[PDB]
Design a protein around this nucleic acid. Structure first.
Ligand SMILES: Nc1ncnc2c1ncn2[C@@H]1O[C@H](COP(=O)(O)OP(=O)(O)O)[C@@H](O)[C@H]1O
Ligand SMILES: Nc1ncnc2c1ncn2[C@@H]1O[C@H](COP(=O)(O)OP(=O)(O)O)[C@@H](O)[C@H]1O
Ligand SMILES: Nc1ncnc2c1ncn2[C@@H]1O[C@H](COP(=O)(O)OP(=O)(O)O)[C@@H](O)[C@H]1O
Ligand code: BEF
Ligand code: BEF
Ligand code: BEF
Ligand SMILES: [Mn+2]
Ligand SMILES: [Mn+2]
Ligand SMILES: [Mn+2]
Lengths: 437, 437, 437
DNA sequence: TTTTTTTTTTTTTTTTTT
């Protein structure tokens, strides 16, 4: 199955079910042929997990690169998150022979930006083979997994769960993973369970991977933070079947609107979440709702998110970000999306001289679109105007409340707007013009 | 006055004037007898308020449950909003001995749904006593309050107010609460006052309770968001005496019409609004219009609103919602309403496969009947037809404007209809048939 | 031309052709002299339009007040509709030095009520100068406009239009405004044109001003909603030369009759409609019928309409409305009308205790004389009698159809009467007596 | 059959990863 290493640059695909070994066996086999391999994964939990596992199961301590930890052993295999890969400047000269873009079904800005970067610097960097691996390629439907029994949940059960219920004897003893669409529910559920006599713990972006015991009975309640790549040796998985996504609406009021919505999971999500169990042994998968929506395409808001990440986290200029997204969108076999690069690039190119103090605050707060949020805060402060509203999202301005007054120079809509609004700010006019043509 | 805890399940009533302590002293006294008590209140502002107050006045940090915050201390008393109670799945097995349905005069869908839920799961959950508390029972007239002087407003005053006027020296210094029937007026009035040298602030569903200072001179302009349960230590209250309500009209054109109207407040509203002052000390109540209309009965539109909330917010099937409303309507001592359960249940049972993206948008927009609005949007999009009109209510479809064409498949009337209309859509025919018999 | 600001109160007139700048340059020049200016305009479209224009053409973001939007910048100029002015309580103490009553040729109840209010509170409010501005004073004939070529329409053309025809090449490309006497024709025409390949859109009271693009080729089909104050940068205007007006007939059968009729436009209307083009550049004006009827006087039905508006929208008692209309009728240079204040005041003074639910419904339905309509509905319901007929105007009673029976207690005639009629109701007898002397 | 303008205008509790 693994693509043979060609004598000249080449991008190939690798498709195999969840748990088959695309992230472990494959890269090992390549190393065995005397090749230097880099494996990029979107999950921090999974990346760190390869360190320990590859150690005691393949006798090879690989190099590990993540925001949390770094281990340089000098082995021929390196596991890194896409995020850490971008923050390190991308490809190194003659650093690797093969680069494996793992979980290339991920449609988060960092993975898109990362894979684009690879597809744009790989050959020049001296790599002979780039591999796009995933168990759920762009246009694919959920297929039965040999190790996973799929059992729907009913209304019987002492624990309420998205309309259905979870029977305690179903998670009393053993290792189990419960997917919840938001951190808030993860917290409540984990609590509900702990207050029952169960060893429950919650996990999501922001918490420490150590919270998950390597062994022993445990019930982990998490978000899509544990959706891909991760192996937690779970006997079962309970999926709410819902997910949080973002959409962009060009409502010209005055510019665009980025709305976060909770919707039914798509095929990719269902297969990946299900895939957290049945890894090297039989497992059970319990769900709330059957079926799902098709995949293969992602919203233009994701592109917006890439420019924002490029500007806020990876010191990439809009132009530079374009070159990378272009490589991605022009490569066959990946998720497709409306070509709005020019538009988004021209938008962000206008957002200059942002307040560093504000940017820093929205990044550390975990805000979505930290750059756009902070930029709007910047514009407001400079106009001594209040933010769109006074909710958490704009706390970085509460400190100026006594001086701020008048209408808000709305640049775009990132949430609810309560204060009066003015649409005459230069940037607003510039964005509208970027939309008119 | 407080009902004694029986040895077997029993639902009792508790009626006492506003500010007497039904939501604080009573639940404390029960806890003192070694009982676990749950207090459900419709107000988020009031619920959070019990946290701090019960702390420094009854030396007992209770558990707090609301959409905004959660505090699990482990105390024998828990304060929760009806909304948060429903979103948590309802009653917990052997979680409480007594459940107090506070402010059971509230006729909003969430309170009705909540109380029904309690009256349907309480005994089975192991509760021995359910208490229905309020200062304004179903068929009751406004009675004089010992701490409140009622002074009508006149035409003298620099601030215009619903036909009358408010004298500045009447609110210059001290703490005051001004009731306005809509957020729009709350905003204008608060502005008018701030631009006078007064510390004014507006408050309604959507803003943050923190906007109201714990102490110091302040003038709060709010909607019925601060009508019940809340204690803000106000020296006075100024009431516009008007309120926003909803009505359903079975106009068979083609189906029904839900109309929002501004009308004179009823007795319940007058006593509750008045009751925001005179809490533990003398207070003043100024009004625009005297007298009021009788209470005890609510419009069938409220039931419609419950099914819609059940479907949009609490993951309840129409059938499940019916079981809860039935418990409510069959319990003596509560507000009565036409028994249209069967009808409304059959209506919503037909509205399936709604677009999640649309539902999500109408919920976050605060639209009334978010499910019906979104469902109509769904039907339109699927027929590539435009919405009833192009006002804010249908913005979620503006994005398809270029493709939408032809007449609107009107399912029912939720507002003004400007575009041409077709009444042949399956759902429309189904609704008409639900009405014919 | 602009009246100099006197040291003591004074009401002056300002007459200048359409598009000369009475609503923009003039108020700016006053602000330049360190004066605070309020500009009242009857059009919502025009008012919002001043916001953007004054911004990028006079570098001054003015305060904007309308039902749809509010922008408080703190500038020395404020633009407001008469409607919004009345709903805010009228004049503010020492809020402005100059009040400019724009488009004082408008004979709609709101403008009349508004200007009367100003002429009655201005001095007391501390204003030094009240200005009555218009391009078409009371007794004035249509005069040639230097920027407008007037070209009659013929029978040649593919688009039928009030007896004549419109040649497609006359509106194919460019910006054009077409006046139609009713919303129904606006809809059909706009459709007819869109179904030809033209970017056509309809506009009238009720739709959103956003429907009109700021630029690009467009054909707007509208009612007198775009008759005054508005600047849409149109290359031409096509006028049907007809308008909808109302008349009152004291037919003593039993009381009066208010009839809506379609008639030939008067001079004011022709000059104002023509004035939508040729604003800052040459334009074309095409018409169906030449000439027109003289202006300067309006029907007693307008006064009736003021009391009704005062009662239904501006919380004004008949007595209060009289004080304002009196100020209007006693001020030289404005449109004159029969002095029937006493009569109309005594009529409305009798209409008390109207059903709020009905009033609310006729207001939201856009009915003319919403108060009188709703009052008649109220009387009927209280007598368990059916309405005058069963047409749209009385839909608010269809819901009682099964209980209503007998003759209709006709209070007056607002339309066709089909059901049997009784003239013995107290209110009817009271109205007749108000007419007898 | 064919057929009517213009400006004022709506609350409450559930709720978002990567
Ligand atoms: N961190 C780990 N802990 C325990 N087992 C692991 C771990 N990583 C991999 N494995 C084992 O190796 C198999 C292949 O894992 P992996 O390469 O991650 O699969 P995938 O094809 O999904 O990328 C799994 O089925 C599992 O049994
Ligand atoms: N949050 C609070 N802040 C200050 N005082 C409070 C608060 N809550 C309750 N109180 C005091 O306790 C009394 C009883 O309050 P409460 O139980 O809420 O009354 P009710 O009978 O209306 O339910 C009030 O009159 C007031 O003096
Ligand atoms: N909203 C607008 N958009 C474009 N031009 C405008 C606008 N408002 C005013 N103008 C320009 O300024 C001139 C004066 O407009 P205005 O003050 O409204 O005239 P009027 O004398 O009719 O009240 C117009 O001829 C036009 O060129
Ligand atoms: F396909 Be494996 F779950 F990364
Ligand atoms: F009766 Be209290 F005001 F809740
Ligand atoms: F006289 Be302008 F057209 F208001
Ligand atoms: Mn993998
Ligand atoms: Mn209470
Ligand atoms: Mn003008």
């Amino acid at each position: 199955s693994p693509p043979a290493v060609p004598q000249t640059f080449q991008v190939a695909h690798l498709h195999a079910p969840t748990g088959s070994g695309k992230s472990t066996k494959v890269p090992a086999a390549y190393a065995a042929q005397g090749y230097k391999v880099l494996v990029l994964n979107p999950s921090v939990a999974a990346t760190l997990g390869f360190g320990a596992y590859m150690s005691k199961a393949h006798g090879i301590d690989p190099n590990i690169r993540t925001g949390v930890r770094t281990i340089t052993t000098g082995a021929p295999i390196t596991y890194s998150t896409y995020g850490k890969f971008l923050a390190d400047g991308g490809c190194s000269g003659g650093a690797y022979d093969i680069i494996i873009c793992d979980e290339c079904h991920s449609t988060d800005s960092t993975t898109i930006l990362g894979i684009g970067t690879v597809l744009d610097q790989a050959e020049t960097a001296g790599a002979r083979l780039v591999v796009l691996a995933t168990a759920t390629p762009p246009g694919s439907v959920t297929v039965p997994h040999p190790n996973i029994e799929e059992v729907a949940l009913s209304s019987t059960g002492e624990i309420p769960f998205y309309g259905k219920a979870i029977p305690i004897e179903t998670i009393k003893g053993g290792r189990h993973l419960i997917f919840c669409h938001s951190k808030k529910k993860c917290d409540e559920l984990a609590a509900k369970l702990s207050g029952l006599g169960l060893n429950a713990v919650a996990y999501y972006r922001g918490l420490d991977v150590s919270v998950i015991p390597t062994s022993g009975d445990v019930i982990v309640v998490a978000t899509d933070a544990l959706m891909t790549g991760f192996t937690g040796d779970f006997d079962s998985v309970i999926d709410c079947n819902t997910c949080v996504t973002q959409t962009v609406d060009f409502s010209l009021d005055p510019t665009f609107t980025i709305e976060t919505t909770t919707v039914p999971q798509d095929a990719v999500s269902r297969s990946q979440r299900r895939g957290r169990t049945g890894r090297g042994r039989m497992g059970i998968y319990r769900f709330v709702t059957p079926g799902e929506r098709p995949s293969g395409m992602f919203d233009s808001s994701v592109l917006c998110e890439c420019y924002d990440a490029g500007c806020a986290w990876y010191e990439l200029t809009p132009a530079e970000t374009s070159v990378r997204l272009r490589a991605y969108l022009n490569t066959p076999g990946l998720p497709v999306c409306q070509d709005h690069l020019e538009f988004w690039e021209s938008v962000f190119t206008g957002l200059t001289h942002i307040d560093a103090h504000f940017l820093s605050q929205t990044k550390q707060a975990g805000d979505n679109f930290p750059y756009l949020v902070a930029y709007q805060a910047t514009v407001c402060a400079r106009a001594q105007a209040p933010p769109p509203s006074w909710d958490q999202m704009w706390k970085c301005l509460i400190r100026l409340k006594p001086t701020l007054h008048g209408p808000t120079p709305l640049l775009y809509r990132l949430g609810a707007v309560q204060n009066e609004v003015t649409t005459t700010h230069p940037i607003t006019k510039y964005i509208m013009a970027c939309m008119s043509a």
